Every structure is written in structure tokens, then in C-alpha cells.
Amino acid sequence: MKIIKLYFESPVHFGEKRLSESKITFSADTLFSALMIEAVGLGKEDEFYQLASNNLVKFSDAFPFIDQYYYIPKPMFNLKLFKKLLYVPIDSLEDYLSGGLERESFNLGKLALSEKVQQHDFKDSEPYNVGTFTFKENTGLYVLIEQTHPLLEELLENLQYSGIGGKRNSGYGKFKFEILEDSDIEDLFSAKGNRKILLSGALPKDAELEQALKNASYLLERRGGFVQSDTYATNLVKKQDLYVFKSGSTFENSFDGDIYQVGKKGNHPVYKYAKSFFLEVS
Amino acid sequence: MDKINLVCGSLLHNIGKIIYRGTSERAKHSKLGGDFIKSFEQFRNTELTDCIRYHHAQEITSVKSNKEKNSLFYITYIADNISSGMDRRKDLEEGAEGFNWDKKVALGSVFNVLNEKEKGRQNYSYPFVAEPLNFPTATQNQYTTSYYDGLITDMKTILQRLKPDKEHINSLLQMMESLWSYVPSSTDKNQLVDISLYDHSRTTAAIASAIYDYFQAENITDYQKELFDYNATEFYDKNAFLMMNFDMSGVQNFIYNISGSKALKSLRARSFYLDMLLEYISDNLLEKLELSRANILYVGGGHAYLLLANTNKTKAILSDFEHDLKTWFLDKFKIDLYVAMAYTEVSANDLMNHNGHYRDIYRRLSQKTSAKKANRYTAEEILNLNHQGTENARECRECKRSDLLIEEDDICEICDSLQKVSRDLTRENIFVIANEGVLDMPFGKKMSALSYSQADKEVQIYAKNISEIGQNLMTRIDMGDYTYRSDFHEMLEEVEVGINRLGVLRADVDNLGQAFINGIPDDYLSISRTATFSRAMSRFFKNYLNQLLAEKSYKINVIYAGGDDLFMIGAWQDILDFSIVLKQKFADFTQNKLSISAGIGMFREKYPVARMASLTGDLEDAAKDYTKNAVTLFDATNVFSWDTLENDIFVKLDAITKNFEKLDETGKAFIYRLIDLLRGVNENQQINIARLAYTLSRMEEKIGKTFAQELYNWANADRKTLIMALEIYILKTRE
Amino acid sequence: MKLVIEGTIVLKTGMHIGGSSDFSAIGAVASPVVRDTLTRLPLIPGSSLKGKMRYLLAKELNNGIDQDEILRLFGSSEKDKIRRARLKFNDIKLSNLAELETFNVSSTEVKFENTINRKTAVANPRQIERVIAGSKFDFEIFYNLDDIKEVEKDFENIKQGFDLLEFDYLGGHGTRGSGRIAFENLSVITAVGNFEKINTLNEILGA
């Protein structure tokens, strides 16, 4: 298991339904879509989808990190006996679970709002506004992968000089990436456990959804939007809405998701990575 | 025998306290109340009369054998006993010959018991007024026999126009809420003195209905042996009650996350939609269980609490209601709204706090509600969510969904209906739910928000303020619906002195949950005391906030009102003016037993409303970091307290507006110059304070001699109070 | 097959791009400039540079009749014309602030202007924040190479946009003094994918 630490050199915009509103981090849907667009840029989207569908690449949602501290979302535990807390460090999960344990503050950056206009010559200009998020100086995001492949690294390097998120051609989203294989996180992931914490925006297939929802504390998340290409349907069109579990969810039974197809009435398919990525705890 | 006589008796007993406190007759109060209903309301329903007249143990054992079994006053007796919170068997009946009852005791406040361990016990009382504003004073109030005579005459005018039936229980509850909300339940020492007659009567009718339904399902006739052959210990220990809750999720995400350019005009419509949605859901469930509205203990902002019987028929109706409500909410608001119906089994000894466990009711209820929120949907509902996704090149402007679009314009139907009702919301509009209407609702009903002669119309009518109680027959539901002008551009153009910015106030009471489950001492816990505390807090926020805003006509639109969340928006000068008086009147209401933390934020009118509410809330949690008395003035770094803001900021601003109104033209340039360099030394360099030591010698003579009496002592070492007062002065003085 | 064009925007005259409404300092009667939110140092938005280059390039072209050069270089989304933009602009932040600290001077200034009414002969002043002249902004703009038969015409159009912008201003009150820029150190390096004719782009942009 390896890491992809994303040190950002620019404001980002990772909107949820907006241009004016943004979140601090992105998801596996967006990174899979970005890598698929970089694959069709260099003609390897048949290879990349065959790698991703056969579980040769498996990446979680991008998660925050401050100095030598990797963070994950606050796992929804259904324990019996920190509402403003949202991110607990991944190494501190055992003694966060063993008792009511806050050691240091969580600061990643702060949100912003860019004020832009759409200038007209002989007409009054149109204001609009882009909500952004600027990271702090020695912070960023990381993505957990395992058994990395040279195609994944080539596509990541091509995505590095293209932009991640929204409004990327208009000033945002540039970053640099690094692998930096760690030893503590891989030992934390290799250990089994009775309860497993989801880490990507997954959705089980229709023959395992009942098995997945047994002793489950989940949160559904609507993950859709408009199709970003040029060869799809000669006008802007919204893909199929897919409701996946949120990345902080916690399950008893394991599952492997699917790369669902959300675009069918077009010249090329549109995919949505809802494969499952788990972390075992006790 | 029946139910409706028991419900109207359990509401309508203990009226002989307000009869006996208004006359010179010295009978027991049960006899006076029975003679009042029997004599005046000229029809003699024997179950009603025996439920009023015989509800103490002495008169029950006086008329026990010659009076029948299954006679409905044992339920009233045991319901009064449970609702009081302690045993009322050996206590003498109010008005008897064996005690000296003073018939002019004032109603105490519930707040003089709350937080007794750390804030101390007080003794406050409510002065009588003959709405309007009523605050607990720190003086020994005393009522008058004329006051109770006036209440008797009001009951005489308002009881002759009713009749004990299923449709009149709402009017009877509104009778009790209008008149008896300030008369005390008992005139002795602090057993039920803090508890009003309305809250005690409402609670005893709710649990009387629950006990009646539990006995009817378990088909135990002869209640006399099962509540008097012992001290009803066997009944006290069996689970005879359920206390369920509703809990709407994503209410802030429904109100503030709207993407419109004109999204500011729909916030009141969306907040109204959610509140009245919860009101109708709870009232519809009470209709399905054949229970009165007295079984609502608190229907609040985002949640409701109901007490209801522990029968299998009730659980069947609850399961059907939950499934239909879940399906309707999925078919309108896909993930964005969810109502969590969780219930727990509680008992009468558990209600009475006999063995502790009264905290454990709401602890178990919150645990089961969180467990329901964790597993929100089933597998079939998730499959139907993923099955209905289509591809389409259309989307709403505001709520940005692609289903339920209108064919003529790219807009979601529910979101357009919110637009229509926002256009049709006034200061006097009542709201009508029927089959045809504007605003889509369960269960196949829709809501119109019509006023007033169109309400001559089957239907349920929800009014903020009721005109006549008895004859007109509609249910009174209150919310903090104060709007100044209902359009932000025009009211921003009305103000002319300050900057043209919109100000947002977001506040909440510190620790609702802690003061709500373990604020009251354990030895004073009751169902009626929880009811009167919840009703007092909601009554303050909705009714009192509306009346303080209508008193001095502030340029403020109220979006949400409540202890858990408050949200008002308007002219930023009026936000800054009203924040201090909101804190002052909240401290007057709660006797400083509760604290309120606010956050102000100033924005343009065309600022995005979701980002506006979100970062006003992050200044809110910046104030809550400091959950104390704290206000953040437009930024997360400018954190004050309430007393500092009040005293220091307002005397500093009044002094600055006094002596800075010379006027002068380059004197303003000097003001901004000194502000900018005070901020420059606030960047923490002492060469700048050496510069400022040089600078004061430059700027004595510019304002004259008014500097060196108070301004130099404030500007001694770059006070944050002074720069904030100067900042709000130069913000209040612009084009 | 993905290119990087590096350069520097120096300011011959001051610059007033944009404005924040973040209550940073809106007390002072002076329209502020756009700054980075964690360093509070002056910033050229990538949208401003991109939009002014698009405006001047689409006005120099499309005379007497946008054409597909502008759409293929800057992207479009019409009812039938949807193209991916080839240029990836980034937000540009201040570079020589250490050089601006050798002179013991701020990163930004304030400029006063009156407005003499002709009827009543009276002046009302107003203030404008400007980032000062002598400021430098190191930028990098990313070009992706979809087709080699169009890269030389695209880079000819990019240099045309750069010197057209060098004879105009970059945002704000440019008719009344400010905004004048000068692009220097314009060079092209390929990021991924070895491109066989890169020196011809390095001389058509570096001329």
C-alpha cells in the first residue's frame, strides 16, 4: 500500500452542487474521472478501465494531511456511550475508539470566494463568484493506493499538469504529487478486525446490498453532475444520479463495489468509481 | 366507559382552584369545580362530573363502593399523581378545612430551579397582566381575587360556546393555554408552584389518554382494584407508555443551500415549510392514534416529542406511519430530508423519577434516534434511488435537481411552490391544509397559506394568532415569523447613513442538551416540569422575539427562531442594535441561568446565501470556542464577550459619535489614518508604537482638546475595544 | 504532449485587479485588490489574464465579420460547439517581494483620484489600492497538445495575445493610468511527452 500526497500550488475548487461553494477535499469519483480523461487524452482508457475494474488499482477518497499526520473522516461508529470534530488522525483510531479521547487542533487552510465578472463591451457586465479553498503552507491531500501500476503513475503525472477539480483552466487546481511509501500506514491497514471502516464513496452491487447493510452506520451521498467531454451528445447533459455511501461509513460485512455506468445515451460511456476501500479496526 | 369524557375531564378537572381562588366560598376545590361544570355548562355528563369531582384519594374512598367500577376517575387520579411527579395521596385537597390556603400565590418561574448546583436557587414569580411580555421579577408578587374572578368570567363566556367532543379538544387546550398559563398549580410550598395549571392539566390529560388506551388494549375492566387494592405499585412498574420522537434531518441544508440569484426571498418560505411540515406530521399521527393534541409534549424546531400508549395497535399504526412518511420523503426530497421516528418503552415509576431513570428516557430515545439515523434507508429504497436516475439536459435554477421539473420553465416544482408561497406570506396569513393547494405535503394534502375570507371552507387550519377560541375552531401554531419588509434590496435602500451591507445574526443558547436533560435537579424532575421548560423556551423565542422586534421596528428579517438555532438577517446596523437587546432580554427571561452565544456577519446583498449562512455559522463556532457569553463581530478573530460588547463598545461608540461629530473633512482622514496605524501596531511591532508615540504629538490639536479626557486612556497600548469601536463608527458613517 | 510556458508579468504602471469582500480591511475607504488568502500578498488571477488575452485576441481577429482559433485555444460551450480549452491558466502570485523588501516599501500602495464636477467645480476624492510598479509575477500556463499541425499557429496566437496585452492593460482603471504590463522571460518547456520541435515554439514565444 502506497500514498499519493498532493501538495497544492494554487487554490482549488471542489464544488458539490455549486460554483460558489467548495469543500476541503475530493473523492474517488473525481480522481477516477480525471484519470479517465487523461487516459482518453493519450488513448489508454481501455487499459485503465480494465485495470480499475479488475482491482489492479484501488484508490480511496483524497483525505487531508497536516505535518506528518494523515487524517481520515470521523468514522460513524454505532457505539452506545466531539460533534464539531470531523477528522481524526488515522493512527489514533484505536485509542479514539478505546475511550473518550483533542490533542491538537485541526487546521488545514480556509475557504475563500473569488469575485469575477463576465465583461461585455456594449452591455453591463455579469458578476459571478467562485468559492475556493486555499491550503496551508505545509498541508495538502493524500490518496491511499495499493499495488501501484505504471499506467496509474503516467496518468497521475499527466493530471499534474492539467488540474484537479473545477475551474481548472481558469486559474485553479494545480498540484504536485509524490508516492512516499510508508511503513506505519501499511501495517495499520494489513491488520484485520471485526469492524471495517469504508474509505471511498462506494456502493455495493444489487446482489450484495442486503449483506452490506447488516450492522451498518452509513450515510448516503448523491454523486452526479454534468458530463465533461466533447464527444458526448453534442450539448451539455447531466449524468445519471448515483447514490453512494459516504467515505466515513463503517460496516460489519465487506463488499467490493463496481465502476457504475452513468452515461448510456452518448457516443462514449461515462463511468463512476464506486469500488470499496476498507480499513479494519476492533 | 368512553375516551372523550376522560380527556375533557382530565383537562377540565382542577378548575376549582381557579373557582375557589375567586370567591369567598370555602368548600373543597373539587366540589367547586364539579358544581361549576354541572351548574353553568347546562348539561350534566356524569363521567365528566365524577372525573372532576372525584380525583383525590379522600373523596374516592368516600364514594367508592356505591360508585361503579371502570368509572374513568381512577385514570384521572393516577394521572394527576404521575403528572405531579410525586405522590399526592396523603396531601390534603386544596381548599379544605384542615389547612390555611392563601389564594393569591403567584406563579413561580421554572428558571429558579434550573442549574441549581452552580448558579444557585432563586425565588422569582410572574406578575399578573390583564402576549404581552411577561418576565419573572425578583419581587414577591401576589395575585388578586379580582384576577381569578375575571378568569372565571372569561371561562363562563368561553365554555358556554363549547361541548365535550372530539373537535373541541383543541379549543379547550387553547382555553387552558390562554387563561391558565400563569395561575399556579398549587398554593403551598414548592411542590408544583413553578408548574402552571395549563402544563399540569395538559400533562395529566396526555397520560390519562395513554393509560386509558393501555387499559383498553389489555382489556382490564375494574380499574379500581388495579389502582387501589394496593398503592398501584403493579401498574407503576409495568411499561404502560411509549415516548416517541420525530427528528427532521438536514433542515439547515434545506433552508440555506439554495443556489438562486433571488434565493434570499425564499428563506422564510423554506423555514416555514419545514416547521409546519413537522406540525402537520405530528398532528396527523395523533389523528391516526385517536389521541388529542395534548399528547404533544413539545413540537419544536426540527423535532417533536409524543407520549402515547404501549399497545400493539399503536405500534402497528406507528410502523405504517413511518413507512408512508419515509416513502413520501424519498419521493420528494431524495436524501436532503429525513424524519427519524424512534420510540422507547417507559413506565410510570420511570416517569415519576421514583428509581431515577427519568434522564434515561431521553437518553434511550436519543440513542435510538441516532441508531435510526445511522441506518437511514433499507436496501429496496437504495435500489429505487439508484434506479430512477436518468440523463437529462435540464436543471432547476435554485434547488438544482433534475426531477419534478415544470415543462414551461427549468424549475423544480416544490421549489417553485416555495417561490409562490414566499410571494404569498404576510404578517397576518393563516395557513390551510387541504387536498388542493400551493405547497406539497403528506399525506396527499397540500397547503395554501391563504388569508382570510378564503378560510370559510376536510381541512385543517393553522394560524399564528387565533381570533376567537371557541367558535372559529382552528389550531394555534406559533413561529418566529418577523419580517420587516420581506425584500432585502428595498430595505437596504431605506437605510442611508451607514455602509450598504447586509448583516446576519446567528445565535444559539449555550448547552440546550445539558440544561435540558440534566439542568433540573433530580429531586424536582417531572414530565410537567420538562413540558413547562420547553414551552417557556419556545414561547420566549417565537412570541417574545416577535414582540421585541415589532416594538422597535428594526430592519430585520427573521429566518429561524428557537433556542437550538436562530438566524436573522437585515440591515447590519439594526443587527448590531438588536443583538445586545436580545442578549439582555434573554438574560431577563432566563434569570441569567442560560447563556447565548452569537455571531454577526456583514455581507453584500448579492452575496451567496449558503456561503453566507455557512461562514456565519463558522464565526458562530468561533464564538462557541472562546460555549460562553461570546460574540464574533463580523470576523473570526474579532471575538468579544457580551458584557464587553455592551458596556465598552457602546459607551465608546456613543462617546466617539458625540465628540467626532464636529464635523471636519480632513478630520475623517485623520480618523482613518489613526485606525490604520493602530492596526499596524496590532501587527505587533513596537517600532510602530514608537511611531505612534511620535504620532499623538502630531494629532493632539487636530480634534482639539477633546482627545485628552478619555481617548488617550483608551489609546494607551492599542486596545482592541477602541479599534473595534472606531471601525464600527467609520462603517456607520459612509455614503 | 503537454507543454509549459513560463514567464514573468512586470508592471510598468500599477494595477488594480479585482476586489475581496471578505471583511479583511473594508473599513478604509479604498477599493482593495485581490490577494492570496493565507499570505495576503498580491495576486494576479488566472481568469483575469485569460479573459483579457481572450478579449484582445478575439478583437484583433474576427474583424469585419468567434472563429475556431479562439475557441480551440480558450474553450467554448455553445449549443453545438463544445471544445476543451488547450491553455491551462493558473493564478499568479507575487514574486519579487524580497526585492520589494530591499527598498523598505510595501507590496501595495494607495492612489488618490478626485472628480471635478463641471457644474459645481468641487472635488470628491476616492482611493484605489494598486499593486505597485516594479512588481513581478512569475507565471506558468499549461498547454496540452492535441494536434501537432496546430501548435505553431496556436503559439503564434499566444504571442500575439501577449504583445497585444503589452499594448493594453490588465484589469481596472486602465484608461486613467494603471494596468500597463510587460511580459518577460517567456519560454516554453515540455512537461510530459517529448516534442520534437520545441525550439521553434521557444523562439516564436521568446522573440
- Whether C45 and A161 lie within 8 Å, measured CB to CB: no
How many C-beta atoms surround the C-beta of residue A79 within 10 A?
7
Hey, what's the cell of B709?
479626557
Residue B17 identity (one-letter amino acid)? K
Query: Measured between beta carbons, which residues in chain C are less than 8 angstroms from residue A127?
Result: none
Residues A202, A276: contact at Cβ < 8 Å? yes
Contacts of B696 (CB under 8 A, 6+ apart): B712, B715
Q: CA separation (Å) from B294 to B171, B283, B297, B315, B683?
A: 11, 10, 7, 19, 60
Q: Determine the Cα angle at B698 with ends B692 and B703, to 5°.
A: 105
Length of chain A: 282
Helix B527-539 vs helix B197-217: angle between axes, to the nearest 10 degrees?
130
- Measured between alpha carbons, how far is C88 from B344 in angstroms, rounded to an integer? 59
Hey, what's the cell of B122?
432563586
C-interface mutation test, from B671, B672, B682, most C Cβ less than 10 A away = B672
Q: CA of B383, closest CA in chain A: separation in Å?
A: 7
Residues C107, C131: contact at Cβ < 8 Å? yes
- Whether A131 and B608 lie within 8 Å, measured CB to CB: yes
Within the 319-338 window of chain B, which residues sit less than 8 Å (CB to CB) from chain A?
334-335
C125 touching chain B per CB within 8 A? no
Q: CA of A160, closest CA in chain B: separation in Å?
A: 29
Contacts of A142 (CB under 8 A, 6+ apart): A3, A4, A5, A6, A62, A63, A65, A70
Interface residues on C facing A, Cβ-Cβ cutoff 8 A: 1-2, 4, 18-22, 34, 36-38, 45-47, 50-51, 55, 75, 77, 79-80, 82-85, 87-91, 142, 144, 146, 191-193
- Measured between alpha carbons, how far is B592 from B586 in angstroms, rounded to an integer? 8
Q: Is the peptide bond before C45 cis (omega within 30 degrees of 0)?
A: no
B-interface mutation test, from C23, C37, C38, C107, most B Cβ less than 10 A away = C23
Hey, what's the cell of C115?
472628480
A-interface mutation test, from B253, B376, B386, most A Cβ less than 10 A away = B386
- Measured between alpha carbons, how far is A141 from A7 in angstroms, rounded to an integer? 7
Could you list the residues of B known to form a binding site, using ranges: 247-252, 271, 275, 298, 303, 373, 508-509, 511-513, 534, 560, 564-565, 624, 628
Residue found under cell 429561524? B560
Hey, what's the cell of B211?
393509560
Q: CA separation (Å) from C150 to A189, C41, C73?
A: 49, 38, 10
How many C-beta atoms surround the C-beta of residue B452 within 10 A?
11
Residue A175 identity (one-letter amino acid)? F
Q: Determine the Cα angle at B3 with ends B1 and B5, to 5°.
A: 85
Find the Cα–Cα–Cα–Cα dihedral B257, B263, B265, B268, rounded to 10°.
Answer: -10
Could you list the residues of B known to form a binding site for Mg(2+), using ranges: 247-248, 508-509, 564-565
Residues before each break in chain C (C–N > 2.5 Å)? 65
Query: Which residue from B minimizes the CA distance to C22?
Result: B603
Strands B475-476 and B460-463: parallel
- Whether C88 and A158 lie within 8 Å, measured CB to CB: no
Hey, what's the cell of B436?
388542493
Exposed e or buried b for every residue in B568-597, given b needs 16+ CB within 10 A? bbbbbbbbbbbbbebbebbbebbbebbbbb
HSE-CB of C22 using CA atoms within 13 angstroms: 23
- Whether A238 and B371 lie within 8 Å, measured CB to CB: no
- Measured between alpha carbons, how far is B113 from A56 in angstroms, rounded to an integer? 65
Classify residue A161 by its DSSP letter.
T
- Measured between alpha carbons, how far is B577 from B584 in angstroms, rounded to an integer? 12
Residues B389, B334: contact at Cβ < 8 Å? no
Chains contacting B with at least 3 CB pairs below 8 Å?
Answer: A, C
A17 touching chain B per CB within 8 A? yes
The coordinates were experimentally obtained by: cryo-EM
Identity of the residue in C34, C77, C142 whose CB atom sits nearest the CB atom of A161: C142
- Measured between alpha carbons, how far is B483 from B568 in angstroms, rounded to an integer? 9
- Measured between alpha carbons, how far is B336 from B44 in angstroms, rounded to an integer? 53
Report which secondary-structure segment, H or E, holds A4.
Answer: strand A2-8
Query: Measured between beta carbons, which residues in chain C are less than 8 angstroms from residue B603?
Result: 21
- Measured between alpha carbons, how far is A34 from A25 in angstroms, rounded to an integer? 15
- Whether C28 and B734 lie within 8 Å, measured CB to CB: no
Exposed e or buried b for every residue in B48-63, given b needs 16+ CB within 10 A? bbbbbbbbbbebbeee
Hey, what's the cell of B728?
464600527
Could you list the residues of B known to form a binding site for ATP, using ranges: 249-252, 271, 275, 298, 303, 373, 511-513, 534, 560, 565, 624, 628
Residue found under cell 408552584? B193
Length of chain B: 735
Query: Measured between beta carbons, which residues in chain A are less than 8 angstroms from residue C56?
Result: none
A-interface mutation test, from C21, C76, C91, C168, most A Cβ less than 10 A away = C91
Hey, what's the cell of B529?
416540569
- Whether B679 and C29 lie within 8 Å, measured CB to CB: no
Number of H helices, E strands in chain B: 31, 18
- Measured between alpha carbons, how far is B616 from B735 in angstroms, rounded to an integer? 26
For residue B700, give the 3-state DSSP assignment. helix
Identity of the residue in B375, B378, B383 whose CB atom sits nearest the CB atom of A206: B383
Within the 12-41 window of chain C, which residues sit less than 8 Å (CB to CB) from chain B?
21, 23, 25, 27-29
- Whether C21 and B603 lie within 8 Å, measured CB to CB: yes
Q: What backbone phi and psi angles, to 5 degrees, belong to C67?
A: -75, 165
Residues C113, C168: contact at Cβ < 8 Å? no
Residues B423, B408: contact at Cβ < 8 Å? no
- Whether B679 and C25 lie within 8 Å, measured CB to CB: yes
Q: CA of A36, closest CA in chain C: separation in Å?
A: 15
Residues C186, C5: contact at Cβ < 8 Å? yes
Query: Which residue from C minimizes the CA distance to B673?
Result: C28
State the DSSP string of A38-62. Answer: HHHHTT-HHHHHHHHHTTSS-----
Strand spans (E) along B514-636: 556-560, 566-571, 596-603, 631-633
Task: Summarize chain B as % helix, strand, coil (round to 5).
Answer: 50, 10, 40
For residue B403, give the 3-state DSSP assignment. coil
Identity of the residue in A80, A131, A241 whose CB atom sits nearest the CB atom of B389: A241
- Measured between alpha carbons, how far is C164 from B544 in angstroms, rounded to an integer? 64
Nearest Cα neighbor of C161 from C82, C91, C81, C73 is: C73
Rg (CA), chain A: 19
Residues A100, A170: contact at Cβ < 8 Å? no
Q: What backbone phi and psi angles, to 5 degrees, belong to B390?
A: -120, 175
Query: Measured between beta carbons, which residues in chain A are less than 8 angstroms from residue C36?
Result: 134
- Whether B672 and C27 lie within 8 Å, measured CB to CB: yes
- Whether C90 and A113 lie within 8 Å, measured CB to CB: no
- Measured between alpha carbons, how far is C155 from C207 in angstroms, rounded to an integer? 12
Nearest Cα neighbor of B162 from B174, B177, B146, B150 is: B174
For residue B566, give the 3-state DSSP assignment. strand
For residue A145, give the 3-state DSSP assignment. strand
Q: CA of B659, closest CA in chain C: separation in Å?
A: 20
Nearest Cα neighbor of B10 from B278, B229, B291 is: B291
Identity of the residue in C37, C90, C192 whose CB atom sits nearest the CB atom of A157: C192
Query: Measured between beta carbons, which residues in chain B are less than 8 angstroms from residue C28?
Result: 672, 675-676
For residue B648, give the 3-state DSSP assignment. helix
Query: Which residue from B minimizes the CA distance to C30?
Result: B672
- Whether C88 and A168 lie within 8 Å, measured CB to CB: yes
- Measured between alpha carbons, how far is B544 from B132 in angstroms, rounded to an integer? 8
- Measured between alpha carbons, how far is B49 from B30 in angstroms, rounded to an integer? 10
Chains contacting C with at least 3 CB pairs below 8 Å?
Answer: A, B
Query: Measured between beta carbons, which residues in chain B are less than 8 angstroms from residue A208?
Result: none
A221 touching chain B per CB within 8 A? yes
HSE-CB of B496 using CA atoms within 13 angstroms: 1
For residue B235, give the 3-state DSSP assignment. helix
How far from each other are the two terminal CA atoms of chain A, in whole angstroms?
Answer: 20
Find the Cα–Cα–Cα–Cα dihedral B698, B702, B703, B706, rounded to 10°.
Answer: 50
Q: Determine the Cα angle at A102 with ends A97 and A108, to 5°.
A: 110
Residue found under cell 493558473? C90
Identity of the residue in A17, A111, A113 whose CB atom sits nearest the CB atom of B400: A17
State the DSSP string of chain C. Answer: -EEEEEEEEEESS-B------SSSS-SSSSBPPPB-TTT--BEE-HHHHHHHHHHHHHHHSS-----HHHHHHH-EE-SS-EE--SEEEE-EEB--HHHHHHTT--SEEEEEE--B-TTT--B--EEEEEEPTT-EEEEEEEEE-S-GGGHHHHHHHHHHHHHHHHTSBSSSSGGGT--BEEEEEEEEEEEES--S--HHHHHHH--
Query: Measured between beta carbons, which residues in chain C are less than 8 angstroms from residue A157?
Result: 192
